Design a protein around this nucleic acid. Structure first.
Ligand code: MG
Ligand code: MG
Lengths: 90, 95
DNA sequence: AAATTGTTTATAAACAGCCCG
DNA sequence: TTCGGGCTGTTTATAAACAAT
């Protein structure tokens, strides 16, 4: 059943999302979108606060490092270079 | 006796730093907090103790350590982040 | 065995600062 | 251009499920 809650922690799903990109970085919006796209539970069932929980995990875990672009500013979430196992959803 | 305006992380540091050796068992941390902030002795719901344990495990600044003799488990504070918080630092002189 | 201690994840909220229409 | 509200980031608290001692 494609829309039941996945057996992955927010921390796992955030990694899957970031590791799906060639540059191994992703904006917060794109992380919401990636998770919604891949785990429809979050697009159709989860209460609004799941997004609060994503942001909480981003700040909580030192493996998720924020990088602001050379512009001043656009900001991406990355995985610490020494942390990345390159866990992709496949 | 109102709930004091300090975080669990702050109060845990007060407790640990009150000892000679800058180390304290969990049960002594409970007792210390109860004795100095009676909100937790008399009013707080029982889950406050859960929150203490959560804090000790969550924050890397809190480092569990067995005595050299192996028998007691102590909580201590990490050297790369000991700002040395003690209760006495929280007191305003009266104006 | 039973209770205490220790770890991790989830959820909620307060709040600051930034962004943007 | 300012204004105000929504978005993003950080932090603290509470509960729970659970493992380990
Ligand atoms: Mg982080
Ligand atoms: Mg700890």
């Amino acid at each position: 059943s494609v829309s039941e809650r996945p057996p992955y922690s927010y921390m796992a799903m955030i990694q899957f999302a970031i590791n799906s990109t060639e540059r191994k970085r992703m904006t917060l919006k794109d992380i919401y979108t990636w998770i919604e796209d891949h785990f429809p539970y979050f697009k159709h069932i989860a209460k609004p606060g799941w997004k609060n929980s994503i942001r909480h995990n981003l700040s909580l875990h030192d493996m998720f490092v924020r990088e602001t672009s050379a512009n001043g500013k656009v900001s991406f979430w990355t995985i610490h270079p020494s942390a990345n196992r390159y866990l992709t959803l496949d």
